[PDB]
UniProtKB/Swiss-Prot annotation:
Its EC number is 3.2.1.17. It is found in: Secreted. Keywords: Allergen, Antimicrobial, Bacteriolytic enzyme, Disulfide bond, Glycosidase, Hydrolase, Secreted, Signal. The gene is LYZ. This is Lysozyme C. It catalyses: Hydrolysis of (1->4)-beta-linkages between N-acetylmuramic acid and N-acetyl-D-glucosamine residues in a peptidoglycan and between N-acetyl-D-glucosamine residues in chitodextrins. Gene3D superfamilies: 1.10.530.10. It comes from Gallus gallus. GO terms for biological process: cell wall macromolecule catabolic process; defense response to bacterium; defense response to Gram-negative bacterium; defense response to Gram-positive bacterium; killing of cells of another organism. One of its GO terms (molecular function) is beta-N-acetylglucosaminidase activity. GO terms for cellular component: cytoplasm; endoplasmic reticulum; extracellular space.
Length: 129
């Protein structure tokens, strides 16, 4: 599923991400745009052999099991394929664990390079929330 901007903002708010660990909703929408272009089916391969999955590009080296990343962890205890669903519950629940692990949203490279320090509130302008 390819979400609309305000459609995704409303889904993330319903799942408890607005101000989760101090990160306003615009931060999460901005990260999703630049990680995946709002596409739940996005996948990308890393140099080390791991793969990033879903709307928030969660990495199989640490967070999910895809059966082909040897010596990796599965800290969210889920198959990586679950992160590609049109239902974002699994991606959101895992993201809550990631952002609590010490580095906040710096775990998302595109957030650090394209969202951090910008006016992220603009990503939710005009949305009925
Ligand atoms: C969205 C996504 O998958 N991002 C990936 C990053 O999570 C990943 O960064 C590394 O993540 C792990 C786990 O969060 C980091 O380990 C943690 O580091 C903190 C700070 O030192 C420490 O408090 C935690 O104890 C420690 N947890 C564990 C289980 O070890 C690790 O430091 C991160 N590494 C770097 C260079 O930032 C990166 C790198 O694999 O990939 C992203 O895609
Ligand atoms: Cl915001
Ligand atoms: Cl959903
Ligand atoms: Cl933080
Ligand atoms: Na893994």
């Amino acid at each position: 599923k390819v979400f609309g901007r305000c459609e995704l903002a409303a889904a993330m708010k319903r799942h408890g991400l607005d101000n989760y660990r101090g990160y306003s909703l615009g931060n999460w929408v901005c990260a999703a745009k630049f990680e995946s272009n709002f596409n739940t089916q996005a996948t990308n391969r890393n140099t080390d052999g791991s793969t990033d999955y879903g709307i928030l590009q969660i990495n199989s080296r640490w967070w999910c099991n895809d059966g082909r990343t040897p010596g990796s962890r599965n800290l969210c205890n889920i198959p990586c394929s679950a992160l590609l669903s049109s239902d974002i519950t699994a991606s959101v629940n895992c993201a809550k664990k990631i952002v609590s692990d010490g580095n906040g949203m710096n775990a998302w490279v595109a957030w650090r390079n394209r969202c951090k320090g910008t006016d992220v509130q603009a990503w939710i302008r005009g949305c009925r929330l």
